[PDB]
Amino acid sequence: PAVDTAEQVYISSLALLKMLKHGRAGVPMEVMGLMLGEFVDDYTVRVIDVFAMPQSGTGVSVEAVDPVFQAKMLDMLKQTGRPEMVVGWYHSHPGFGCWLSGVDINTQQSFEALSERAVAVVVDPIQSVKGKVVIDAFRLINANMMVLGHEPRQTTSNLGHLNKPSIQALIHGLNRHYYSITINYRKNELEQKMLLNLHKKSWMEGLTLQDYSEHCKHNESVVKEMLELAKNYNKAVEEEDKMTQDPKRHLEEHVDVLMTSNIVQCLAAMLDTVVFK
Amino acid sequence: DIPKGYMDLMPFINKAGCECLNESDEHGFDNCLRKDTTFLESDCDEQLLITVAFNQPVKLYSMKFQGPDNGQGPKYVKIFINLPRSMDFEEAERSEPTQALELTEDDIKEDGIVPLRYVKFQNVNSVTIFVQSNQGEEETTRISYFTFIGTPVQATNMNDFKRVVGKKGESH
Amino acid sequence: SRTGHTHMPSVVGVLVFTQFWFWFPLSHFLSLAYTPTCVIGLNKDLKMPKVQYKSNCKPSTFAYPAPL
Amino acid sequence: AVQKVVVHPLVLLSVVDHFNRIGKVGNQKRVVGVLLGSWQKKVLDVSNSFAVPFDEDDKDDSVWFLDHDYLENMYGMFKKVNARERIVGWYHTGPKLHKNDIAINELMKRYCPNSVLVIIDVKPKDLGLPTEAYISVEEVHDDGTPTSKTFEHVTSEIGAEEAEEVGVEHLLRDIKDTTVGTLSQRITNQVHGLKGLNSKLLDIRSYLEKVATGKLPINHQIIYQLQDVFNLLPDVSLQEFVKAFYLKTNDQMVVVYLASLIRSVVALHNLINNKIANRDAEKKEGQ
Amino acid sequence: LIRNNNTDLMILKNTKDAVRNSVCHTATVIANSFMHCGTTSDQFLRDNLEWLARATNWAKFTATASLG
Ligand SMILES: [Zn+2]
DSSP states (O other), X not given: OOOOTTOEEEEBHHHHHHHHHHHTTTTTSOOEEEEEEEEOSSSEEEEEEEEEEOOOSSOSSGGGSOHHHHHHHHHHHHHHTOOOOOOOEEEOOOSSOSSOOTHHHHHHHHHHHHOTTOOEEEEOTTTOOTTOOOEEEEOBOOTTTTTTTOOSSOOOSGGGGSSOOOHHXXXXXXXXXXXXXXXXXXXXXXXXXXXXXXXXXXXXXXXOOOOHHHHHHHHHHHHHHHHHHHHHHHHHHHHHHXXXXXXXXXXXXXXXXXXXXXXXHHHHHHHHHHHTO | OOOTTOXXXXXXXXXXXXXXXXXXXXXXXXXXXXXXXXXXXXXXXXXXXXXXXXEXXXXXXXXXXXXXXXXXXXXXXXXXXXXXXXXXXXXTTXXXXXXXXXXXXXXXSTTOOEEOOGGGGSSEEEEEEEEXXXXXXXXXXXXXBOOEEEEEOOOXXXXXXXXXXXXXXOOO | OTXXXXXXXXXXXXXXXXXTSSOGGGGGGGGGGOOOXXXXXXXXXXXXXXXXXXXXXXXXXXXXOOOO | OOSEEEEOHHHHHHHHHHHHHHHXXXXXXXXXXXXXXXXXXXXXXXEEEEEOOOOBOTTTSSOBOOOHHHHHHHHHHHHHHOSSOEEEEEEEOOSSOOTTHHHHHHHHTTTOSSOEEEOOOOSOOSSSOSOOEEEEEOOOOTTOOOOOOEEEEEEEEEOOOHHHHHHHHHHHGGGOOOSSOOHHHHHHHHHHHHHHHHHXXXXXXXXXXXXXXTSSOOOHHHHHHHHHHHHXXXXXXXXXXXXXXXXXXXXXXXXXXXXXXXXHHHHHHHHXXXXXXXXXXXXXXXX | OOTTOOOOHHHHHHHHHHOOSHHHHHHHHHHHHXXXXXXXXXXXXXXXXXXXXXXXXXXXXXXXXXXX
């Protein structure tokens, strides 16, 4: 048997948010938790929920699982509507990359022995600057796999080569002791709307005018800067036409900003004059 | 009967969770699980609500839920799965089933096997079966046999978590 | 085909072949889109007679690529 | 009391997930849970939640079994996980209140005297926030109308820590809206603002019609706020406002006109550059 | 196609020599399949059976379908 290079760990929206929150809720200590999910068949690992684990001093190791805690919370989740498995464990690496180091391989070996499909997800919450989420999923390579003359994981689809690995992980052996399974976040149509509500602008913000004093100051400043750019532009056009750009591009961006601001505020003003009387 | 690869889900049923609401004390739940002609009777009305629980999630291919052939047999079988709480004969009459079988005498007979929509039963821990109507119309309903045919889903049985490698002191 | 009719085996094969990005084994389906460029003469009783047709173009314009 | 309740995207997604994971296996309508968060002045910050088993009879409307033992154990576990978060109320995913709500709030007031019920509407509407927050108040009414234990609104908002913005941004990057004012987007924003104003005015009119015809009692607070709104309506026919409006409209349109002239000159310059490039190419090709 | 099977196996021999990965192994299996399509001549597979042993799992599928 082999693990295809199309396997994906579909991390749900709730799981991703919980992971990032727990990472920056305990940086620069490391944090750990379980990933309740579902092994669909052989190419899918669905991480439906994640599962914080109390900080226990011994970093993140096998002794940091606290069997009483996990058992009791799994029972309680079962009776509240989560009859889910334990597909792997996530554990943050606060700022020093997304890979594994020794104890991680030992712990993931424990999880695999429990069930040989459990992934291990690593999140770097400091490097997760807004606009880039650094999460990577991993699983081990059998000692009799790369030494017996077999590639770590077969390849039947062109899917597994659309993401390039990072040198940070290469150094620690992204391809000598463990894989890298793709993520492929799974978003419903309701979660996306509920999240859009985060920055959704109110009708008030749509229909509210801009402080006229500040608007006039902005008009004046932009028109002056545009005058300077226009003098430079005259000089540039004369010089280029004589001897045979930055002024033109800056002038274009500034004209854009002035026109958008003025038209928007003027139309808002008329709309209000009609709507509120 | 049993296509290769699928096995009867008797061994994975734990009595810790099995129950059957509205059952006559004369004929108990143990009757439906012997393959003998020992039956289960309805107590008050022409309705019944069985519930079976499995140790590890299982996949259900077919059901052998059959009764006698004297007009006292299940007619409308509503199957729900994975119920957080034991339900009542009032929710059983409106809740949308995961399956809505309407048995016929052919299925009722000893050689009748009713196949379910396999896809909706890919992870089953608890099954509640509501018999809403009898084959004809009898104040008491009777069930002669009931067993599921399917496959078990590989279990990640926590509490088995142990050090398979290394010392007992590494932290990170 | 050689008469303007859409060739169902060919279209189907090319589609399933393009679906190799997801499953390599399907790449074989392109075999369905291989029409032999042939002009086969048959005699009255559907037997194959020994004859030679003549082109009107340099052989190098339509000859096999040279054996490497 | 508490004026503001800022809910978090994790709370919202958790509620959605609870509703889905129970509705899939049954049909319960409501799903009920506890909210965990922290105070800062009179500004509640709901930053987590968890389901608590619930079951009620939709006929009797006074028989329900919110499970306080489960609540306590679950809160113990989350207290171990993170301690700067104490129970700050509850939530239920029902589009409207229910008779039980006051009794459930009385139950939860054991664990938080200042309880905030956030009715997180799973169904995605297109005009309002999905959270509406309430707090229980019993007090002798000033107008002498008989007093009963009923809810009072507490302003609600959605805000996020940076650790959650990094997630929401990534999840929504596919269908995101540029965080900059493109003129089309701004005109769209104003149209949506008019949509919303119309919706709110229709709501007010429907309520006033119901009040007038008598199907509802009169709420002096609502009448106060409405007549204050009318009080605040402005006047536009006033001369020294029409003068000022014309003055600033003209100033804005001078800026617009200068912008347009600059754009025209730049466009002509680019056209000349391209015509010269093509002329050179044609001449070189000819020679 | 049998009669006019004027194929050059030297190109495939060079490709095989250049094969290192299993992607390329199955790629060359498919390439031989194409090159011989219609031609009931499996000489490239018949004269290299050591090389048709590094394909395991979902590559033996492709090799057998290639005979097809
Ligand atoms: Zn680690």
